[PDB]
Amino acid sequence: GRFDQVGGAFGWKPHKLDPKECAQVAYDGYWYKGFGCGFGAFYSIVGLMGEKYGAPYNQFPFAMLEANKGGISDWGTICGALYGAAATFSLFWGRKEVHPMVNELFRWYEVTKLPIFNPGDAAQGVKGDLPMSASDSVLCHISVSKWCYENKIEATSKQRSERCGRLTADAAFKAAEIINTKIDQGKDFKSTFPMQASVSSCGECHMTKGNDANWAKGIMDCTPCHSGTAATQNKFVNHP
Amino acid sequence: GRFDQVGGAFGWKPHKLDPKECAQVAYDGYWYKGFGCGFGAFYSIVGLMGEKYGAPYNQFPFAMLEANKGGISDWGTICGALYGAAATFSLFWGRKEVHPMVNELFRWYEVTKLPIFNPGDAAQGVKGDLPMSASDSVLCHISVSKWCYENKIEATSKQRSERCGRLTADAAFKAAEIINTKIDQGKDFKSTFPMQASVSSCGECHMTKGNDANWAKGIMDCTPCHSGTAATQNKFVNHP
């Protein structure tokens, strides 16, 4: 009936992946027809399962993930690579089970200095080395803008598009490892990245049912936006 | 070949839909197995097309959209309803064409007071009117938290669960209108919502090629985060 689907909800069969292969295809996918972060990462997971094991994986409308490029048509929201990777988890597991998987993928992203991946000369943007940094944000605007600012590189530069291309690979690689670990540990799976400090402490009031201050939703690290930093001071007045 | 898909990229045949139908369906879909905002929205478009026209629409793994519940596994990033609705656009059109569609849907969401949709006695979460407001953000965290704060409503209440359900309906409604208009107008589609003030004013420096300060990526309204409001001041020291 209505709301149901071919194969049932979360009824696809997961298959272990080769993280190295994934990082690679994700990076390549990123440049393909200029589809981007979401497409490359998504494809490196479900796309590779399709090439090796056929249906249902190979029946997916892959380019739909172009939607996530630039945090969804340049709105700079969720980093496309992150969505593309986490979305695949929902093809196999449901809400309760996917939560710790995305928590690990997302918390890892906030703290790890990236990119790590290097295509060598398979580089389609700029060959070379790129500065690494921890974004402390799963949001594209924050991740990209901070890095460009800090490194005096333009968000239009071939470098930042090379950077996002490599990040797609790192996220693909990490997501792949998480999928593998999930297949192994079954319903025992646990995130290896503990809850963020700010999330836990602020959460005491803002994310605890019954609390008079329990208004907030979202477990992104609170630090970037709620720290009174120069960046978050009023830029609409006296801002050269 | 690798990276291609059944039907070619953006190869689906779009069909006009009834906005009021989608709104109703999206609202139901929202509660179905607790799948949420992204599931209802996406389904009310592609799902209905499946029910009414068959393959390929009816072949889609709908439950994957549960990935988006609560701003992606409770992370509070892009609102599930917005992503779910926008995603559908990429099944029929390429990024060039989709950009103005997402721009209108997202801008519409920022400036419009919601929710509008009212299931009356058919409310599946909690019956009754709900306070409306413009979020100024396509991010579930800012949208929800600010609304709970300003109305003193726990983010864990049925009231807010009901609000997000209604919001899903509004989003689905608007996306259908956009899709319909896009079908009629073809390559001449233009968004009714213009670029936000802060984005083009701040963008003059930050999102313009060649300018030293060209570091930012993202066309979200800059006001909530770069205004030095009470909210963005340091909440880590002397708070509350």
Ligand code: HEC
């Ligand atoms: C409970 C002991 C709290 C902790 C821990 C933190 N906050 Fe809080 N916050 C609390 C209350 C009761 C209130 C409202 C009344 C008031 O004191 O003004 C707030 C309000 C906020 C706001 C609103 C804007 C403001 O005026 O400050 C924000 C955006 C907010 N709190 C953020 C926040 C963050 C991110 C925290 C951790 C770093 C944090 N609060 C902890 C109660 C408590």
Ligand code: HEC
């Ligand atoms: C930036 C992307 C943010 C992150 C990460 C977190 N919050 Fe936030 N929060 C942000 C803004 C710009 C706003 C809107 C403020 C406004 O104009 O109303 C909010 C709002 C909240 C609120 C509600 C009170 C309010 O000022 O509206 C709370 C209680 C809050 N945020 C808490 C908070 C905590 C505890 C977070 C970490 C898990 C968190 N926010 C992250 C921007 C951002």
Ligand code: HEC
């Ligand atoms: C050009 C005339 C600009 C306009 C208009 C705005 N910004 Fe800006 N910004 C510009 C420069 C050259 C710099 C360099 C540092 C400085 O203070 O001179 C910046 C920097 C920022 C920053 C980060 C650095 C900081 O002050 O902490 C942010 C967060 C930023 N700008 C945001 C921003 C927004 C939101 C604007 C509109 C309200 C805005 N800027 C306009 C140049 C120009």
Ligand code: HEC
């Ligand atoms: C909140 C959800 C945000 C919105 C909407 C916009 N920006 Fe932003 N911006 C925000 C944060 C938390 C940061 C990181 C600050 C840090 O600690 O480094 C940024 C960063 C930028 C930058 C880079 C410089 C920097 O301070 O790191 C710029 C130039 C900037 N933001 C500009 C800007 C403009 C013009 C926006 C609207 C189109 C905009 N930001 C929205 C948070 C958020």
